[PDB]
Write a protein that binds this ligand. Structure first.
Ligand SMILES: O=S(=O)(O)C[C@H]1CNC[C@@H](O)[C@@H]1O
Ligand SMILES: [Ca+2]
Length: 670
């Protein structure tokens, strides 16, 4: 279970026969040192550099047997040392606790042994890679980037005035947790800046900007079993409300009458509609970016007259109303004033209230480390959204904490920055828990951190461009779902049609309908107008568009019994709803390299069309008896090509599924 072999100051550590650590004087496992962080932010985009002062290999290791395991004193002369404790924890997990000699040694580099053939998955929500082997991954929550690839034109345009284009590793939800194909997970407790480097064939290197580190590992015989264990450590999500399965949630702005009119147009045309999502429930702010929300979390009766009574009528017709909140407060409005009066805002170095620039306006940061401010903001949600009758909301942002804020708990903003998303999620979760609404109300988040696996009821993929790019278009959503599934979050959707509308990018009708085909094979369907609604093709753009939504929402609703079962398994044991093919086909080597296809539950395989102008699509089937959803044709394992016009996405089901007869009914929809 634990094999430590000591000897010339050299050792190895095996754990359930996996080699975890090796150390000798010539090949050390540990370096320590110091640096001065050089971090700046503009509008959520961060520039991060180290001024590295020292990096020193600790070649001398003195070992002793301990109360619960082994203690290693590492050093390089008397002046430079650290201690490592090796134990089991309360549940049998390997526990490594590292503490440097003093606080001035604020850098660590730790190497873990690896094999050249190993694949690595997770690190939160990753949009450019699913398998992480071969590259390094900085872990710092931020804006996710527009374009995200230096070689593409839009990324270059987003970089022109502002550091906004980003790169392959930028994300709203990085997490210091990964899975190896030696069938273990590694979880790090720290929230400091970290870089997890998976590029060397013989070792993984974990770099931390702190004087201590805590890591836990567990193994298992299958990936399914490993995810059950990972979610028993980090959390499991609740079952979704029953109405999520009942149709599409329409994203609409412009007030009570506009919402009513668009609702009737779609319902009257045969579309299954379960909800209206109106982010402008609190008012609007026009900026050069386009149409934004007014960040003051109170119902605006000028934009939305009679909303309270109108929600009661919509609910009797089987339609829910969903709103919008974030953990910041516009500086020109009432809630910010109320928070300043009480001292509820994050401060600057001089003790004044810190105002962040959010894109042509300013806002305060509600200090969620102050228990009274956190209680106050939870009451804002309960009184202004739950009591109004909202069935859910977008719970946005979490990524913008500057490193020169000062917080009520006295912990550096260099450490609290990455921890803010799960603190925000917990605020939402407890609002629901204290009003008895878990399983009835649904909120959805884009940002996350350790513990969002418990506290976030649903993830969405944040802001994609209204384009076909691999790094920031429709395609990018699949690695995002898969990476999070491997980090213990199994409920994921996207904006139908994407969001970011800039430069020459504008949403075509073809993009909207292909994205609709994709989302009908996920656990939630919800549209978005985008930041410039007049430049994008919308769900009611023409009769053909409306009819495509009626067909594909009939497809999604038909799947209800199946999806409900999958969501219940995710709640019970962390078995995610959208699954990497290797969860069920562990001996197929080729499945470990796929990024753009997934299993929906156990029995459906989906390979979404993510390129413009296609009439067919090529994909990989693992070895099983498959049936093409739309033709009923039989297929076996191998590379295959199928016809794929709009409305017939590349979808296959297992012939031997207990659900085969439900899936066979799909080809008879109009
Ligand atoms: O423009 S707003 O900041 O108010 C709201 C948008 C930003 N976050 C993600 C988008 O989906 C929202 O519409
Ligand atoms: Ca983006």
């Amino acid at each position: 279970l634990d094999f430590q072999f000591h000897q010339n100051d050299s050792f190895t550590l095996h754990f359930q026969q996996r080699l975890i650590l090796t150390h000798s004087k010539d090949n050390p496992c540990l370096w320590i040192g110091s640096g001065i962080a050089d971090i700046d932010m503009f509008r959520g985009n961060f520039s991060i550099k180290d001024k590295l002062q020292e990096k020193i290999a600790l070649t001398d290791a003195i070992v002793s047997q301990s109360p619960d395991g082994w203690l290693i004193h590492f050093s390089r002369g008397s002046d430079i040392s650290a201690t490592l404790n090796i134990s089991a924890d309360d549940q049998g997990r390997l526990l490594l606790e590292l503490q440097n000699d003093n606080l001035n040694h604020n850098r660590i580099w730790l190497r873990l042994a690896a094999q050249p053939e190993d694949h690595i998955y997770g690190c939160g929500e990753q949009f450019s890679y699913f398998d992480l082997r071969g590259k390094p991954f900085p872990l710092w929550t931020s804006e996710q980037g527009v374009g995200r690839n230096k070689q593409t034109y839009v990324t270059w345009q987003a970089d022109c005035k502002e550091n906004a284009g980003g790169d392959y590793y930028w994300t709203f939800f990085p997490q210091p947790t990964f899975v190896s194909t030696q069938k273990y997970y590694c979880h790090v407790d720290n929230s400091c800046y970290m870089n997890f480097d998976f590029s060397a064939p013989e070792y993984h290197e974990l770099a931390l900007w702190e004087d201590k580190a805590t890591l836990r590992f567990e193994c298992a015989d299958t990936y399914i079993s490993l995810l059950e264990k990972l979610t028993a450590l980090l959390g499991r999500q609740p079952e979704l409300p029953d109405w999520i399965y009942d149709g599409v949630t329409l994203g609409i702005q412009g007030g009570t009458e506009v919402c009513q009119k668009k609702l009737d147009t779609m319902r009257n045309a045969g579309v299954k509609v379960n909800g209206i999502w109106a982010q402008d429930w609190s008012g609007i702010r026009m900026t050069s970016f386009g149409k934004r929300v007014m960040w003051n979390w109170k119902w605006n009766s000028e934009n939305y007259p009679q909303l309270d009574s109108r929600i009661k009528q919509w609910n009797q017709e089987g339609v829910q109303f969903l709103a919008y909140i974030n953990p910041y407060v516009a500086s020109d409005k009432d809630l910010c004033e109320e928070a300043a009066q009480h001292g509820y805002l994050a401060k600057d170095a001089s003790g004044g209230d810190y105002l962040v620039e959010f894109g042509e306006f300013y806002g305060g940061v509600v200090d969620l480390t102050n228990p009274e401010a956190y209680a106050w903001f939870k009451e804002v949600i309960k009184k202004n959204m739950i009591e109004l009758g909202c069935g859910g909301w977008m719970a946005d942002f979490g990524e913008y904490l500057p490193t020169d804020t000062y917080l009520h708990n006295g912990v550096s903003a260099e450490i609290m920055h990455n921890a803010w998303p799960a603190l925000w999620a917990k605020c939402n979760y407890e609002a629901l828990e204290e009003t008895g609404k878990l399983g009835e109300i649904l909120f959805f988040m884009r940002a996350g951190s350790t513990g969002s696996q418990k506290y976030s009821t649903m993830m969405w993929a944040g802001d994609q461009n209204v384009d076909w790019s691999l790094d920031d278009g429709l395609a990018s959503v699949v690695p995002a779902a898969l990476s999070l599934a491997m980090t213990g979050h199994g409920l994921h959707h996207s904006d139908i049609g994407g969001y970011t509308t800039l430069f020459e990018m504008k949403r075509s009708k073809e993009l909207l309908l292909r994205w609709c085909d994709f989302s009908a094979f996920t656990p939630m369907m919800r549209t978005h107008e985008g930041n410039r609604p007049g430049d994008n093709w919308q769900f009611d753009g023409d009769a053909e568009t409306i009819a495509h939504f009626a067909r594909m929402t009939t497809v999604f609703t038909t799947l209800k019994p199946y999806l409900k079962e999958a969501v219940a398994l995710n709640a019970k044991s962390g078995l995610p709803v959208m699954r990497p093919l290797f969860l069920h086909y562990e001996d197929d080597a080729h499945t470990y390299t796929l990024k753009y296809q997934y299993l929906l539950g156990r029995d459906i395989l989906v390979a979404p069309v993510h390129e413009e102008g296609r009439s067919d699509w090529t994909l990989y089937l693992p070895e099983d008896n498959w049936v093409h959803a739309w033709t009923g044709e039989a297929f076996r394992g191998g590379e295959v090509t199928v016809n794929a016009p709009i409305g017939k996405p590349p979808v296959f089901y297992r012939a031997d599924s207990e659900w085969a007869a439900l899936f066979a009914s799909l080809k008879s929809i109009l």
